[PDB]
């Protein structure tokens, strides 16, 4: 009697990965045609909405290829939010009936609201992006770029049609803020959007604990990242020293927001100070919300571990958040995800250094971005070797579904009839 | 042809097993997940649901079923309330299992078509088998 | 709440500040140590990290080295003794609690000291057999005693300019030192369990003893094979050595990484795939109730086995046919996560204060937090804030794991509980 | 206005839901964490605590709240102890639910200010409602 | 020789400690985890399991062991159930501890091979001991 | 001048409180850590120990104490065995608190110098208080 949520999660991704991979090889979608590994990498990047590119999205793909790319990252981003919310609903249904045996809307309405929320969010971002690019690029081309980037931003994909992804719009508030708002709400999570939508009149105090965590941790994650990036890169001529005072803050805020899974870059991370790469690595690992279009280990997982640590250092018996106790299984889930993620990350970084030769900071940054699904590159993907591409594909797949799958493994372990005696192991 | 069994205890599971052997579609529904899994291999469709919930009974279109058997024994109030909800659901034939004489009185007045008392009913037959 | 955390910190700071104020005196140093340098040396000796802002053999006098043996002896042996004593009191309180619901400490301390003295005497004899012929009847004996004490206490302090790089091809000294910190880092609980119940067999040893006796050979073998594979073709570290020399060097680094801190090769010229392996080895560290450091092998074993249990969706973490209770798994995972958080903060602070590549800063931070003290060329150029950060990291690294383990054991009881609510993860 | 309700059974949760619907901030305290969870959904602050313990009641700072409602029904000993501790804490107004006349007299002697007998008071209310 | 001892009371732990002291491998099974921990110190393998559960016994592979000793004392129902399940699992020799002459006869009917009455047999043994 | 109290229930804690207030050395010993912590503020030295363990009683130099009070009430075997161990340890005067008459008879036959039965003795005392 073990849970089957893990199997639905993997089969769903691979059930779309393989069809997407074979389509990209056809010359209809590529001007030159993609090899099997390149198409497998591109499909995995699109389906996981990582946004890593072995080839340039704007140039190597045709008009039909970009339309396919929008479909893949809409399936990868909104599809995870739709599936994760669907599996969350069924988990609650099983839990609710279990309580009644011992002692809410239907699924269709929930799925309709998720797709409705996605299209309206993209449509709002669509008109703002159209408002600027249509005058510059014409009508027919202007709407396409607005639609491609609004879909990419909401799905936390980071795919861009420009050679340098949004590096020409560092000093453009309308493009930066429209994109920033898109993956912030796209990455916030439908449970947070839904709870605020139905219970805002009650007040912040009566929102669900998960909603309160996401509504508080996200601004601090944005604010701390914005201040830290600005402080560490204000004097760096190569990235932010040449911008105006407002331009620096706009760039610092953009990368602070884009790190949490979007993957767009107003500046060059290739020329970032090391103390800034370490800050962004932490930001990428934390990721977006739990039931959103993108994410890494997720904000709530980091928040529980952050306050579990604070509880442990103060020797308190219970982990408390917003006058609510976080039960020990939840704490174990959050700590296990971080430890398991580090185990896979360390193995992936070690393999990358063997297949291709690069510095540790370049390898570590690329491994985190692929695992955290952010897709920000520090120059490793440009020179990635053939075996390195295979590792990145696996890391992108595991990083996309790992935290969610491992959570459901912890939720429903296989029941057993044989238990061994408890014995103590010394730790510390 | 098409039957529904609510409550998958010892009595209810026995109904499901014999009904399947005669090649009939049986909808086995029980609040407890473990009991539904036991009948999952003996019925056409096994569903975990609370048949005291009026909207749940509406979704499970029990009016389409020829006969509905309520086999809830321990909680007298659930069997009485589930019987009523099945009546407003449009079920023409409702068979209810009752463990006590007082429960069998209430079920008769609320409209159950057949009241089954396994101890009393088995008592009569076992005597008849003893006689012949 | 438990006072084990308070006894652990007060005991360290009550030997660090005196040891620091003594190191400033010119009797112990040929040129004298600054307050920052003396504090760094005292922290490295008492925490037996082995990191050096000044050369041990040159900058210290004859009396200074005798103090250094006393300091690292106190660090290693006293940490082992205090851990055993606190474990004994924890067991006593647990037993009395069990009786309420439903050996001697002096003898234990005597066995700890006598085992240390016997091991150090064996290492001293083996080292004297090799150094006395070429160094004299007085200086060779001193070097043998110093290096045996350093090896057993998992300190890594060396009297040579290059710490054992001249004996990469010498098997006698390499195996003598290797056996000293493997046994010194095994844990006195394991040594006692093997000493008292070896006739019963391996099957009836305590679960911790089995975990150590299996993982330590596995960790040593994995480290040796990985270091040999990754560094066999590197001319600057192991390419010039013979086939036996390469394996001896690989085994020596695999063992020294687990807290000793001696180096028969240059880690400054190591391939990055090998520095990652050595970082992983340093983080794991030595045994729980031993002279070494790290997250400890038992913690890494429970997390590795818990991970396998979670990936297989099993209900219980089972090790050697014994269930590992959920508080133990939570302790191990919390130790790893908190260690990672402090490590990330320390690397960020070092990167702010000092200008170096990420691999060097990360390696130095891991070596100082784990008390291995292996240097990758960054300690020699430490600045003043860098030295302060390293001192803090060495202090927290030495006492952090055991302290955090005991906080999880005895949290403050409460009279107010808030309702349980679910938080989405992953 | 700040209210504290101790015991979250049928009466206690009904008082809390009414008090919070009327715009007042209520504290819900119960030893059964299961019932504290339903209250926490709509109650300003819900706490799992034992209110017969002097130190626990001191931690709750019940003297801050204007009125303290003690709705412990089944355990008369717990009701008496909670009323005594609340009065010794220094709360101005204590309302206690009593299911017996003898318990009501004991609570009057303890120092309870308003004592509610739900069965008898509801009987009087229902009789008046039927009359008019 | 491999022995399985079910139930780790005063009798079961004495049989395990005597069997293991002679070099035989013993499997100790009990539902109380405290007694399984206590036996795990000296017993070759100790397992927390419910031996009245027929699927659990198949996992223990009691058919492999030469002799199975069932030392469930207080719960007579569990004693007969464990004897029945062990016999149905294909155990060659089942030794059962019985606290009464009526339980012993039922165990004889079930298929127990050797039945031990601790009070009566030890009484006979001490009576012989005083004589000689 | 120097006294020992074993068992820190309501009776033993009262003995410790009066003895220390009068100005004497009192070693309070109880297997339960909570009661030892409660009495730690009052007595000169409070130790968590099992006084049924013979080696623990040997380590605690109870023979140096002028009087030893054994105040274990719930488990009669614990009180009897503690009295025996204290008498073997060389304690010249042992005062034991007994709750039942059979326990008092056993303790008298063992050799306890003073047997205290709180209910009977306070019965006599309050009767004398009522008379005058
Ligand atoms: N509201 C309900 N909806 C569906 N099934 C129910 C409901 N209440 C009880 N049942 C089921 O009805 C069956 C009747 O079992 P019963 O004889 O009452 O108890 P037991 O299983 O202890 O013998 C059980 O399997 C029980 O889970
Ligand atoms: N010491 C206590 N402190 C707080 N709440 C208590 C205490 N003792 C009992 N309660 C709670 O007070 C309530 C009394 O209601 P009760 O009559 O038991 O149930 P109901 O009203 O639902 O039939 C219960 O929720 C009970 O758990
Ligand atoms: N169904 C069962 N399966 C396995 N062990 C059982 C079962 N029922 C009881 N036992 C164990 O058998 C042991 C002997 O029972 P009992 O005679 O009550 O204890 P004691 O012999 O110490 O008086 C108990 O410790 C109990 O845990
Ligand atoms: N073997 C023992 N050694 C020391 N103290 C004991 C032992 N057994 C019981 N006690 C203590 O003696 C005290 C007296 O118990 P009891 O008379 O039952 O008081 P209460 O009814 O308040 O628990 C208990 O609190 C218990 O902690
Ligand atoms: K992305
Ligand atoms: K070291
Ligand atoms: Mg039944
Ligand atoms: Mg009530
Ligand atoms: Mg027995
Ligand atoms: Mg008492």
**C240 neighbors C232 (Cβ within 8 angstroms):** no
Neighbour count for residue B38 (Cβ, 10 Å): 15
* Backbone torsions φ then ψ of E61, nearest 5 degrees: 55, 50
Calpha distance D30→D10 (Å, rounded): 13
**β-sheet bridge partners, residue E96:** E70, E115
Torsion over CA of F12, F13, F18 and F24, rounded to 10 degrees?
Answer: 80
Q: Considering only residues 49 to 68 of chain D, which have any Cβ-Cβ distance to chain A shorter than 8 Å?
A: none
C-alpha Rg value of chain B to the nearest Å: 15
The one-character DSSP state at A207 is: S
Q: What sign for the dihedral angle of Cα F121, F122, F124, F129? A: positive
Q: Which residues contact B77 (CB under 8 A, 6 or more apart)?
A: none
CA distance to A400, B3, B28, C113, D66, per residue, from B19 (Å): 47, 8, 11, 78, 64
**A303 neighbors A213 (Cβ within 8 angstroms):** yes
CA distance F78 to chain C (A): 12
Using a CB-CB cut-off of 8 Å, the residues of chain A touching C324 are: 422-423, 425
A276-291 core/surface letters (b: 16 or more CB in 10 A; e: else): bbbbbbbbbbbbbbbb
Calpha distance C80→C119 (Å, rounded): 14
- The whole domain housing B25 covers 1-132
- Per the structure block, which two tokens stand in for E116? 């031990």
**D104 neighbors D98 (Cβ within 8 angstroms):** yes
Would the annotation count D33 as a binding residue?
no
Calpha distance D63→C221 (Å, rounded): 66
CA distance to A285, C94, C102, E29, per residue, from E34 (Å): 43, 15, 11, 11
Q: Which of A209, A208, A251 is nearest to A227 (CA)?
A: A251
Cβ of F46 closer than 6 Å to ligand 4, yes or no, is: no
C219 touches chain A (CB under 8 A): no
CA distance to F6, F58, F91, per residue, from F55 (Å): 15, 5, 15
* Number of Cβ pairs < 8 A linking chain A and chain B: 14
In terms of Cβ atoms closer than 10 Å to its own Cβ (0-12, 13-18, 19+), residue A9 is buried
The DSSP result for A61-111, as a single string, is B-HHHHHHHHHHHHHHHHHHHHHHHHHHHHHHHHHHHHHHHH----HHHHH
SS3 track for C139-166 = HHHHHHHHHHHHHHCCCCCCCCCCCCCC
Calpha distance A280→A272 (Å, rounded): 10
Calpha distance C260→C176 (Å, rounded): 13
Torsion over CA of B24, B28, B34 and B39, rounded to 10 degrees?
Answer: -10
**F38 neighbors F24 (Cβ within 8 angstroms):** no
Calpha distance A63→A74 (Å, rounded): 17
Q: Which of A324, A32, A82 is nearest to A186 (CA)?
A: A82
Q: A426–C87: do the CB atoms touch at under 8 Å?
A: yes
Calpha distance C141→C130 (Å, rounded): 10
**C69 neighbors C148 (Cβ within 8 angstroms):** no
Q: C426–A312: do the CB atoms touch at under 8 Å?
A: no
Number of separate helices (H) and strands (E) present in chain B: 6, 6
CA distance to A58, A61, A389, per residue, from A31 (Å): 11, 6, 21
Q: Which residue pairs, CB below 8 angstroms and at least 24 apart, start in A194-203? A: A194/A113
Would the annotation count D32 as a binding residue?
yes
Calpha distance A250→A248 (Å, rounded): 5
Neighbour count for residue C38 (Cβ, 10 Å): 22
Residue located nearest, by CA, to atom 10 of ligand 3: E7
Q: Which residues contact D129 (CB under 8 A, 6 or more apart)?
A: none
Using a CB-CB cut-off of 8 Å, the residues of chain A touching E47 are: 418-420
The one-character DSSP state at A269 is: G
CA distance C403 to chain A (A): 7
**F2 neighbors F25 (Cβ within 8 angstroms):** yes
Q: Which of C216, C241, C136, C123 is nearest to C173 (CA)?
A: C123
Count of structural domains within chain B: 1
Using a CB-CB cut-off of 8 Å, the residues of chain A touching B31 are: 97, 100-101
- Per the structure block, which two tokens stand in for F47? 């130790």
* Backbone torsions φ then ψ of F116, nearest 5 degrees: -110, 120
Q: D47–C415: do the CB atoms touch at under 8 Å?
A: no
E46 touches chain A (CB under 8 A): yes
**A288 neighbors A299 (Cβ within 8 angstroms):** yes
Q: Which residue has the tokens 């008369």?
A: D76
Q: Which residue has the tokens 């280990």?
A: A297
Using a CB-CB cut-off of 8 Å, the residues of chain C touching E41 are: 204
**A296 neighbors A367 (Cβ within 8 angstroms):** no
Residues within 5 A (CB) of ion ligand 6? C 50, 156, 261, 373
Q: What sign for the dihedral angle of Cα E81, E84, E87, E88? A: negative
Q: Which of C397, C403, C366 is nearest to C48 (CA)?
A: C397
Q: Which residues contact B110 (CB under 8 A, 6 or more apart)?
A: B80, B83, B84, B87
Helix (H, G, I), strand (E, B) or coil at F28: strand
Q: Which of B57, B114, B113 is nearest to B81 (CA)?
A: B57
Q: What sign for the dihedral angle of Cα A370, A374, A376, A378? A: negative
Angle between helix D10-21 and D33-42 (nearest 10): 20
Q: Quick one: resolution in A?
A: 3.6
**A315 neighbors C1 (Cβ within 8 angstroms):** yes
**β-sheet bridge partners, residue A409:** none
- Per the structure block, which two tokens stand in for B44? 């056409």
Angle subtended at Cα A34 by Cα A28 and Cα A39, rounded to the nearest 5 degrees: 105
Closest-lying ligand to the alpha carbon of B33?
1
Calpha distance B118→B100 (Å, rounded): 10
Calpha distance E12→E61 (Å, rounded): 19
Q: Which of C236, C239, C260 is nearest to C154 (CA)?
A: C260
**C286 neighbors C181 (Cβ within 8 angstroms):** yes
B80-116 core/surface letters (b: 16 or more CB in 10 A; e: else): bbbbbbbbebebeebbbbbbeeebbebbeeeebbebb
Q: Which residues contact C16 (CB under 8 A, 6 or more apart)?
A: C42, C43, C46, C395
Experimental method: cryo-EM
CA distance to C62, C282, C302, D88, E92, per residue, from C296 (Å): 34, 10, 10, 52, 48
Neighbour count for residue A15 (Cβ, 10 Å): 11
Would the annotation count D51 as a binding residue?
yes
**C383 neighbors C354 (Cβ within 8 angstroms):** yes
Q: Which helix (H) or strand (E) covers residue F95, if one does?
A: strand F94-97
Cβ of D32 closer than 6 Å to ligand 2, yes or no, is: yes
- Per the structure block, which two tokens stand in for E16? 């395990």
The DSSP result for E58-125, as a single string, is HHHTTTTSSEEEE---S-HHHHHHHHHHHHHTT-SEEEEE-SSHHHHHHHHHHT-SEEE-HHHHHHHH
**C23 neighbors C41 (Cβ within 8 angstroms):** yes
Calpha distance A420→E46 (Å, rounded): 7
Q: What sign for the dihedral angle of Cα B60, B61, B62, B66? A: negative
Angle between helix C207-231 and C188-197 (nearest 10): 120
The pairing of beta strand A319-320 with beta strand B2-6: unpaired
Helix (H, G, I), strand (E, B) or coil at A376: coil
Cβ of B98 closer than 6 Å to ligand 1, yes or no, is: no
The DSSP result for C218-254, as a single string, is HHHHHHHHHHHHHHTT-IIIIITS-HHHHHHHHHHHH
Would the annotation count F72 as a binding residue?
yes
**E27 neighbors E3 (Cβ within 8 angstroms):** yes
**C197 neighbors C205 (Cβ within 8 angstroms):** yes
């Amino acid at each position: 009697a073990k849970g089957g949520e893990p199997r639905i999660i993997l089969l769903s991704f691979l059930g779309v990965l393989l069809p997407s991979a074979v389509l990209l090889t056809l010359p209809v979608f590529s001007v030159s045609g993609l090899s099997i590994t390149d198409a497998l990498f591109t499909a995995t990047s699109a389906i996981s909405v990582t946004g890593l590119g072995v080839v340039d999205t704007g140039q190597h793909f045709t008009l039909a290829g970009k339309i396919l790319l929008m479909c893949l990252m809409q399936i990868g981003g909104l599809g995870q939010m739709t599936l994760s919310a669907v599996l969350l609903y069924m988990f609650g249904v099983r839990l609710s009936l279990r309580q009644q045996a011992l002692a809410q809307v239907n699924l269709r309405r929930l799925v309709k609201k998720i797709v409705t929320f996605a299209l309206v969010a993209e449509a709002i971002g669509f008109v703002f992006l159209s408002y600027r690019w249509v005058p510059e690029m014409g009508w027919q081309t202007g709407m396409f770029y607005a639609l491609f980037h609004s879909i990419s931003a909401f799905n936390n994909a980071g795919f861009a049609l420009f050679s340098d992804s949004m590096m020409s719009f560092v000093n453009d508030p309308l493009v930066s803020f429209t994109l920033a708002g898109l993956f912030i709400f796209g990455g916030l999570g439908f449970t947070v959007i839904g709870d605020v939508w139905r219970h805002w009149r009650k007040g912040f105090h009566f929102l669900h604990i998960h909603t309160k965590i996401m509504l508080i941790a996200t601004p601090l994650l944005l604010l701390v990242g914005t201040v830290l990036f600005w402080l560490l890169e204000r004097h760096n001529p190569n990235t932010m020293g040449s911008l105006t005072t407002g331009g620096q803050w706009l760039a610092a805020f953009f990368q602070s927001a884009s790190a949490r899974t979007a993957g767009f870059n107003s500046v060059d991370l290739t020329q970032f100070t090391q103390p800034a790469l370490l800050i962004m690595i932490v930001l990428m690992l934390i990721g977006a919300g739990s039931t959103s279009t993108g994410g890494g280990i997720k904000v709530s997982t980091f928040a529980v571990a952050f306050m579990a640590t604070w509880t442990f250092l103060r020797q308190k018996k219970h982990v408390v958040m917003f006058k609510r106790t976080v039960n020990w299984p939840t704490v174990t889930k959050s700590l296990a995800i971080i430890v398991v993620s580090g185990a896979i990350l360390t193995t992936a970084m070690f393999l990358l250094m063997l297949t291709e030769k690069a510095s540790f900071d370049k390898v570590m940054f690329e491994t985190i971005s692929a695992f955290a699904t952010v897709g920000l590159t520090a120059g490793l993907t440009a020179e990635l070797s053939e075996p390195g591409k295979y590792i990145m594909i696996v890391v992108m797949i595991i990083g996309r579904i790992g935290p969610l799958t491992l959570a459901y493994m912890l939720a429903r372990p296989e029941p057993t009839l044989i238990k061994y005696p408890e014995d103590t192991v010394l730790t510390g | 042809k098409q039957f529904a069994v609510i409550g998958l205890g010892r009595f209810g599971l026995a109904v499901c097993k014999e009904l399947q052997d005669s090649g009939s579609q049986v909808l086995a529904v029980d609040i407890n997940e473990d009991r539904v899994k036991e009948a999952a291999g003996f019925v056409s469709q096994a569903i975990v649901a609370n048949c005291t919930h009026e909207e749940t009974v509406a979704e499970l279109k029990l009016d389409d079923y020829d006969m509905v058997m309520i086999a809830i024994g321990a909680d007298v109030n659930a069997s009485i309330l589930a019987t009523l909800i099945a009546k407003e659901a449009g079920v023409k034939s409702v068979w209810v299992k009752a463990n006590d004489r007082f429960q069998a009185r209430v079920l008769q007045k609320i409209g159950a078509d057949h009241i089954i008392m396994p101890e009393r009913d088995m008592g009569i037959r076992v005597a008849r088998k003893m006689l012949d």
